Design an enzyme around this catalytic site. Structure first.
Site, PDB file in Angstrom:
ATOM      1  N   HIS A   1      -7.147  -5.737  -1.946  1.00  0.00           N
ATOM      2  CA  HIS A   1      -5.906  -5.106  -1.557  1.00  0.00           C
ATOM      3  C   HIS A   1      -5.241  -5.792  -0.382  1.00  0.00           C
ATOM      4  O   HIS A   1      -4.018  -5.576  -0.091  1.00  0.00           O
ATOM      5  CB  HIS A   1      -6.271  -3.727  -1.035  1.00  0.00           C
ATOM      6  CG  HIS A   1      -5.105  -2.854  -0.762  1.00  0.00           C
ATOM      7  ND1 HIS A   1      -4.056  -2.744  -1.649  1.00  0.00           N
ATOM      8  CD2 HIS A   1      -4.842  -1.981   0.257  1.00  0.00           C
ATOM      9  CE1 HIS A   1      -3.158  -1.884  -1.157  1.00  0.00           C
ATOM     10  NE2 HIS A   1      -3.615  -1.402  -0.014  1.00  0.00           N
TER      11      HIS A   1
ATOM     12  N   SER B   1       0.863  -1.237   0.000  1.00  0.00           N
ATOM     13  CA  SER B   1       0.000   0.000   0.000  1.00  0.00           C
ATOM     14  C   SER B   1       0.897   1.286   0.000  1.00  0.00           C
ATOM     15  O   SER B   1       1.877   1.321  -0.747  1.00  0.00           O
ATOM     16  CB  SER B   1      -0.929  -0.072   1.238  1.00  0.00           C
ATOM     17  OG  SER B   1      -2.206   0.532   1.016  1.00  0.00           O
TER      18      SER B   1
ATOM     19  N   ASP C   1      -7.785  -4.840  -7.071  1.00  0.00           N
ATOM     20  CA  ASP C   1      -7.337  -3.990  -5.974  1.00  0.00           C
ATOM     21  C   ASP C   1      -7.429  -2.531  -6.476  1.00  0.00           C
ATOM     22  O   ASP C   1      -7.021  -2.213  -7.581  1.00  0.00           O
ATOM     23  CB  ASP C   1      -5.898  -4.394  -5.598  1.00  0.00           C
ATOM     24  CG  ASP C   1      -5.284  -3.526  -4.535  1.00  0.00           C
ATOM     25  OD1 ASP C   1      -5.971  -2.693  -3.957  1.00  0.00           O
ATOM     26  OD2 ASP C   1      -4.079  -3.680  -4.172  1.00  0.00           O
TER      27      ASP C   1
END
Ligand SMILES: O=C(O)CCCCCCCCCCCCCCCO
Ligand SMILES: O=C(O)CCCCCCCCCCCCCCCO
Lengths: 269, 269
Positions: free
Chosen positions: A258, A146, A201
């Site tokens: 994600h 991330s 994602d």
């Protein structure tokens, strides 16, 4: 679709990336074995790996992660941890660019990531330097998931061409800047970038191309579902700046996607 | 260690039990398809399965859950939610027993689980009756994770012997009462209780034995680790009230383990 070896490498850095969130670090003395709760990082656990330096909420960026030594695999690992609450981080994600000639000419990066990296760039360069000095034979790897994957990428571009290779393995990272910069990262020598993504994602689709952002190549895209185990035939190499067909397809993106990169990541059981 | 058919059933009702936390809206009108966020329940999605009744914060114990028709698998399923925050639920957990001669001679059961169920029993008994009428050929199954498992188990003990079999599938359920109750549940007719545990999950270890609580027999114990997919070779049936050497072992217990039954459960990506 990728080799066994490179798979194992993807697996191992997804866990160092997950350990950024689920590790016992900080209030952790340097030299401590690295372990995680909730079975987040068993490959890192099986190795002879220990913190070399932990940071938490460092700089204007409030950046968090750790430098690890792994003697089993002969790495030095810089692992940045994404946001403690992803959905909020997505909601408040601001899309402004800023100039970054320091790294490449005409390169603009997300002002925010680039600002946050800058603020801790000196400290962390030194620590990585110490560690390269102590172990000249070790591969230096920067990694993250991330916002973590973003940092590792910016930090990695920033710190190459300085004597040691830097390999970067990013997991669900957002776009990090303009097209020039995507081009820099695609060809810059002195390290490879492995930019990994999973199904639909959401994070790698921000910031949007429309605001000036572009994605480096290639892209390593995991076909297999959320909470489903990944095999070598589930990862597809996608060549081309901003290629479509991997993560960058015209459908509705997803937040759970994600949080599943080989195993559970960006959240801790 | 268990049959394939049996392993299919455990996997399925582990998904219905997870649906009690992740299935989209509890304001869902009667008759709508059953779906979950985050791939929590894809065996349920894949079936022609619909809500019959949805409840939330119902009665004195704030019970949450649903009744469902599965026209593919020929089931009526009553699935109870566990706690929205398990970690507090564990620590706030009271160990008081209450007499339950209403269901069982000389039986003592946990006071809150027991009152909570009593307090919504009449409504839900109705709702199930209506379904058995309509689909006389369908297997009634009650199911539940954590607190929810304990609710399903009490409901199951309480509504058996009224014509139709009740099977019960509990996932990480704590102890529900005393030795006597433990024995009732082991031999009661009019259905099968399937009491599934995972490794060193803490919830099936509470309330303690040292508080007068006992577990029904058998237990089905999943030995594969947290985040590890389960195969029919990874489950072991342990015979005997309070048997040890399944979940009931003297080693250190763990919460992540409670949130992994066949897949993510008790928390929603
Ligand atoms: O555009 C920007 O500059 C970023 C905007 C997003 C802000 C939203 C806040 C998310 C809260 C979580 C805080 C954890 C961040 C930890 C960073 C570790 O490197
Ligand atoms: O001993 C007792 O009576 C129970 C003690 C635990 C209390 C903790 C409160 C639970 C807070 C979370 C709300 C979820 C409860 C929903 C139940 C659905 O069946």
């Amino acid at each position: 679709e990728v080799s066994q070896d490179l798979f194992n490498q993807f697996n191992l850095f997804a866990q160092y990336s997950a350990a950024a969130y689920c590790g016992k670090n900080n209030d952790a003395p340097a030299g401590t074995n690295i372990t995680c709760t909730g079975n987040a990082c068993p490959e890192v656990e099986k190795a002879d790996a220990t913190f070399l330096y932990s940071f938490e909420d460092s700089g204007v960026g409030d950046v968090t992660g750790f430098l690890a030594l792994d003697n089993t695999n002969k790495l030095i690992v810089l692992s940045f941890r994404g946001s403690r609450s992803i959905e909020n981080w997505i909601g408040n994600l601001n899309f402004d660019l800023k100039e970054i000639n320091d790294i490449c000419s005409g390169c603009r990066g997300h002002d925010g990531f680039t600002s946050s990296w800058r603020s801790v760039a000196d400290t962390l360069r030194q620590k990585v330097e110490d560690a390269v000095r102590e172990h000249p034979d070790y591969r230096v790897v920067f990694t993250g998931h991330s916002l973590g994957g973003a940092l590792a990428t910016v930090a990695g571009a920033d710190l190459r061409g300085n004597g040691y290779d830097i390999d970067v393995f990013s997991y669900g990272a957002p776009r990090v800047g303009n097209r020039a910069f995507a081009e820099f990262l695609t060809v810059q020598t002195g390290g490879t970038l492995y930019r990994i993504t999973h199904t639909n994602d959401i994070v790698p689709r921000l910031p949007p191309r429309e605001f000036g952002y572009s994605h480096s190549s290639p892209e390593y895209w995991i076909k297999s579902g959320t909470l489903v185990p990944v095999t070598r035939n589930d990862i597809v190499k996608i060549e081309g700046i901003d290629a479509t067909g991997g993560n960058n397809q015209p459908n509705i993106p997803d937040i759970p996607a994600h949080l599943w990169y080989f195993g559970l990541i960006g959240t801790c059981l």
